[PDB]
PDB file of C-alpha atoms in Angstrom:
ATOM      1  CA  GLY A   1       5.713   3.457 -13.950  1.00 33.55           C
ATOM      2  CA  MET A   2       5.030   6.278 -11.923  1.00 36.08           C
ATOM      3  CA  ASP A   3       3.254   8.606 -14.594  1.00 38.49           C
ATOM      4  CA  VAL A   4       0.182   5.903 -13.970  1.00 36.39           C
ATOM      5  CA  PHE A   5      -0.244   7.908 -10.866  1.00 37.39           C
ATOM      6  CA  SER A   6       0.074  11.464 -12.236  1.00 34.62           C
ATOM      7  CA  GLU A   7      -3.249  12.339 -11.897  1.00 31.44           C
ATOM      8  CA  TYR A   8      -4.441  10.490  -9.237  1.00 31.16           C
ATOM      9  CA  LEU A   9      -1.850  12.319  -7.261  1.00 27.90           C
ATOM     10  CA  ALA A  10      -2.824  15.994  -8.945  1.00 27.17           C
ATOM     11  CA  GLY A  11      -6.115  15.576  -7.308  1.00 23.97           C
ATOM     12  CA  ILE A  12      -4.534  15.462  -3.802  1.00 25.36           C
ATOM     13  CA  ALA A  13      -5.106  19.019  -2.801  1.00 27.21           C
ATOM     14  CA  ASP A  14      -3.492  19.140   0.471  1.00 22.38           C
ATOM     15  CA  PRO A  15       0.385  19.907  -1.113  1.00 21.46           C
ATOM     16  CA  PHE A  16       2.166  17.840   1.921  1.00 24.17           C
ATOM     17  CA  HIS A  17      -0.602  15.048   1.817  1.00 23.51           C
ATOM     18  CA  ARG A  18       0.278  14.786  -1.878  1.00 27.87           C
ATOM     19  CA  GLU A  19       4.226  15.064  -1.178  1.00 29.34           C
ATOM     20  CA  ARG A  20       4.090  12.195   0.961  1.00 28.63           C
ATOM     21  CA  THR A  21       1.694   9.768  -1.319  1.00 27.80           C
ATOM     22  CA  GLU A  22       3.824  10.772  -4.166  1.00 26.68           C
ATOM     23  CA  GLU A  23       7.112   9.257  -2.123  1.00 28.16           C
ATOM     24  CA  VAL A  24       5.420   6.161  -0.790  1.00 28.66           C
ATOM     25  CA  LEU A  25       4.390   5.262  -4.459  1.00 27.44           C
ATOM     26  CA  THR A  26       7.776   6.196  -5.667  1.00 31.21           C
ATOM     27  CA  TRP A  27       9.974   4.544  -2.797  1.00 30.59           C
ATOM     28  CA  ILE A  28       7.847   0.519  -3.719  1.00 32.66           C
ATOM     29  CA  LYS A  29       8.302   1.370  -7.648  1.00 34.52           C
ATOM     30  CA  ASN A  30      11.985   1.936  -7.266  1.00 33.91           C
ATOM     31  CA  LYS A  31      13.006  -0.795  -4.276  1.00 31.74           C
ATOM     32  CA  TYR A  32      10.329  -3.475  -6.045  1.00 30.76           C
ATOM     33  CA  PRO A  33      10.798  -2.130 -10.115  1.00 33.59           C
ATOM     34  CA  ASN A  34       8.980  -5.596 -11.040  1.00 32.12           C
ATOM     35  CA  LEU A  35       5.732  -4.870  -9.501  1.00 34.46           C
ATOM     36  CA  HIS A  36       3.297  -3.255 -12.026  1.00 35.49           C
ATOM     37  CA  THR A  37       1.895  -0.209 -11.605  1.00 35.52           C
ATOM     38  CA  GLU A  38      -2.105   0.055 -11.805  1.00 32.72           C
ATOM     39  CA  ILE A  39      -5.008   2.675 -11.353  1.00 33.30           C
ATOM     40  CA  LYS A  40      -8.319   0.360 -10.502  1.00 30.25           C
ATOM     41  CA  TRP A  41     -11.191   1.694  -8.890  1.00 30.27           C
ATOM     42  CA  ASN A  42      -9.408   5.350  -9.130  1.00 29.07           C
ATOM     43  CA  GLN A  43      -6.466   4.186  -6.573  1.00 27.48           C
ATOM     44  CA  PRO A  44      -2.811   3.418  -6.879  1.00 26.22           C
ATOM     45  CA  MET A  45      -2.232  -0.308  -6.198  1.00 25.31           C
ATOM     46  CA  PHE A  46       0.839  -2.462  -7.345  1.00 21.26           C
ATOM     47  CA  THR A  47       0.191  -5.803  -9.190  1.00 25.63           C
ATOM     48  CA  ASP A  48       2.510  -9.134  -9.422  1.00 24.10           C
ATOM     49  CA  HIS A  49       1.393 -11.371 -12.391  1.00 24.93           C
ATOM     50  CA  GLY A  50      -2.408  -9.522 -12.584  1.00 23.03           C
ATOM     51  CA  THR A  51      -2.717 -10.144  -8.305  1.00 22.10           C
ATOM     52  CA  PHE A  52      -2.768  -7.823  -6.067  1.00 22.45           C
ATOM     53  CA  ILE A  53       0.244  -6.372  -3.999  1.00 23.50           C
ATOM     54  CA  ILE A  54      -0.895  -3.458  -1.949  1.00 25.01           C
ATOM     55  CA  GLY A  55      -3.247  -0.734  -2.578  1.00 28.34           C
ATOM     56  CA  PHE A  56      -3.382   2.810  -1.513  1.00 28.46           C
ATOM     57  CA  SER A  57      -6.264   5.720  -0.871  1.00 34.05           C
ATOM     58  CA  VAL A  58      -6.131   8.955   0.800  1.00 36.09           C
ATOM     59  CA  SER A  59      -8.660  10.897   3.596  1.00 37.63           C
ATOM     60  CA  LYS A  60      -7.955  14.039   5.349  1.00 38.80           C
ATOM     61  CA  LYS A  61      -6.871  12.234   8.169  1.00 40.16           C
ATOM     62  CA  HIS A  62      -4.454   9.258   6.559  1.00 37.31           C
ATOM     63  CA  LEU A  63      -2.984   7.500   3.842  1.00 39.08           C
ATOM     64  CA  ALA A  64      -4.756   3.874   4.047  1.00 40.26           C
ATOM     65  CA  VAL A  65      -2.878   0.896   3.113  1.00 43.12           C
ATOM     66  CA  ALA A  66      -4.653  -2.274   1.983  1.00 43.06           C
ATOM     67  CA  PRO A  67      -2.377  -5.456   2.044  1.00 41.20           C
ATOM     68  CA  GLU A  68      -5.324  -8.014   2.256  1.00 42.68           C
ATOM     69  CA  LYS A  69      -6.588  -9.744   5.571  1.00 43.55           C
ATOM     70  CA  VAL A  70      -4.437 -12.261   6.034  1.00 43.62           C
ATOM     71  CA  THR A  71      -1.419 -10.027   5.658  1.00 42.01           C
ATOM     72  CA  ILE A  72      -3.097  -7.908   8.496  1.00 41.78           C
ATOM     73  CA  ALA A  73      -3.338 -10.745  10.451  1.00 38.29           C
ATOM     74  CA  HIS A  74       0.407 -11.694   9.063  1.00 36.86           C
ATOM     75  CA  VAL A  75       1.821  -8.263  10.385  1.00 36.37           C
ATOM     76  CA  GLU A  76      -0.500  -7.611  13.423  1.00 35.80           C
ATOM     77  CA  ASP A  77       1.828  -7.363  16.010  1.00 37.54           C
ATOM     78  CA  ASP A  78       4.466  -4.658  13.927  1.00 37.70           C
ATOM     79  CA  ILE A  79       0.596  -2.642  13.328  1.00 34.96           C
ATOM     80  CA  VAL A  80      -0.120  -2.283  17.361  1.00 36.21           C
ATOM     81  CA  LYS A  81       3.607  -1.690  18.295  1.00 36.76           C
ATOM     82  CA  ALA A  82       3.528   1.288  15.191  1.00 34.27           C
ATOM     83  CA  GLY A  83       0.231   2.389  16.748  1.00 33.41           C
ATOM     84  CA  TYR A  84      -1.728   2.634  13.743  1.00 33.27           C
ATOM     85  CA  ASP A  85      -5.778   1.917  13.491  1.00 35.65           C
ATOM     86  CA  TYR A  86      -6.581  -0.884  10.926  1.00 35.61           C
ATOM     87  CA  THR A  87      -9.451  -2.731  10.356  1.00 35.76           C
ATOM     88  CA  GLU A  88      -9.222  -6.129   8.686  1.00 37.41           C
ATOM     89  CA  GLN A  89      -8.135  -5.099   5.892  1.00 37.74           C
ATOM     90  CA  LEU A  90      -6.236  -1.627   5.926  1.00 39.73           C
ATOM     91  CA  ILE A  91      -4.286   0.462   7.961  1.00 39.00           C
ATOM     92  CA  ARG A  92      -4.050   3.952   8.638  1.00 37.75           C
ATOM     93  CA  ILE A  93      -0.958   6.023   8.602  1.00 39.66           C
ATOM     94  CA  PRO A  94      -2.198   9.361   9.725  1.00 40.06           C
ATOM     95  CA  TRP A  95      -0.789  12.405   7.903  1.00 38.06           C
ATOM     96  CA  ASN A  96       0.995  13.676  11.079  1.00 37.02           C
ATOM     97  CA  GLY A  97       2.901  10.693  12.247  1.00 37.42           C
ATOM     98  CA  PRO A  98       5.750   8.934  10.276  1.00 39.47           C
ATOM     99  CA  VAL A  99       5.424   6.123   7.308  1.00 37.55           C
ATOM    100  CA  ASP A 100       6.659   2.591   8.768  1.00 38.20           C
ATOM    101  CA  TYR A 101       8.529   1.597   5.408  1.00 36.86           C
ATOM    102  CA  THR A 102      10.022  -1.574   7.990  1.00 39.04           C
ATOM    103  CA  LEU A 103       6.378  -2.878   8.274  1.00 38.11           C
ATOM    104  CA  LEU A 104       5.664  -1.676   4.431  1.00 39.66           C
ATOM    105  CA  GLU A 105       8.455  -3.590   3.305  1.00 43.30           C
ATOM    106  CA  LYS A 106       7.386  -6.981   5.233  1.00 44.11           C
ATOM    107  CA  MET A 107       3.610  -6.917   3.952  1.00 46.94           C
ATOM    108  CA  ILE A 108       4.705  -6.306   0.339  1.00 48.57           C
ATOM    109  CA  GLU A 109       7.426  -9.140   0.678  1.00 51.04           C
ATOM    110  CA  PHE A 110       5.085 -11.268   2.741  1.00 47.03           C
ATOM    111  CA  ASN A 111       2.145 -11.230  -0.454  1.00 49.53           C
ATOM    112  CA  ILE A 112       5.023 -11.025  -3.669  1.00 51.50           C
ATOM    113  CA  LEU A 113       6.426 -14.382  -1.778  1.00 51.04           C
ATOM    114  CA  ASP A 114       2.685 -15.856  -0.327  1.00 53.35           C
ATOM    115  CA  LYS A 115       1.231 -14.943  -3.913  1.00 53.46           C
ATOM    116  CA  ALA A 116       3.617 -16.355  -6.264  1.00 55.27           C
ATOM    117  CA  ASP A 117       0.874 -19.374  -7.256  1.00 57.40           C
ATOM    118  CA  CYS A 118      -2.501 -17.355  -6.594  1.00 56.38           C
ATOM    119  CA  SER A 119      -3.814 -17.178  -9.609  1.00 59.42           C
ATOM    120  CA  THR A 120      -6.951 -14.579  -8.792  1.00 62.27           C
ATOM    121  CA  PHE A 121      -6.230 -10.715  -8.415  1.00 60.77           C
ATOM    122  CA  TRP A 122      -7.703 -11.433  -4.431  1.00 58.88           C
ATOM    123  CA  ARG A 123      -7.016 -13.831  -2.446  1.00 57.33           C
ATOM    124  CA  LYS A 124     -10.127 -16.551  -2.400  1.00 54.89           C
TER     125      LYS A 124
END
């Protein structure tokens, strides 16, 4: 549960950054209650049957969201429309603009379905 994330959240200095980050994680916890909460590489992530679903990290300018490369590709048009800067591995959600929860839903739900038979942590 969310207690897994408490120490990580406390270490976020900026209180608004901490608040939003907590909100996003809690939203996923409550909407996808079968996902497992884990801290790995000192980053909060959600897993399903031991496979990676979605992970997060914080920087001074953004919350970074990592759904794996194939999933960035899957929702690329939606990322461009939202305006987020992205790489092959992640999207950058600036603290001074909104969280696109629709986009997060699509990524999480795609990964749950698409990785149902995935036997490794990361896609191979």
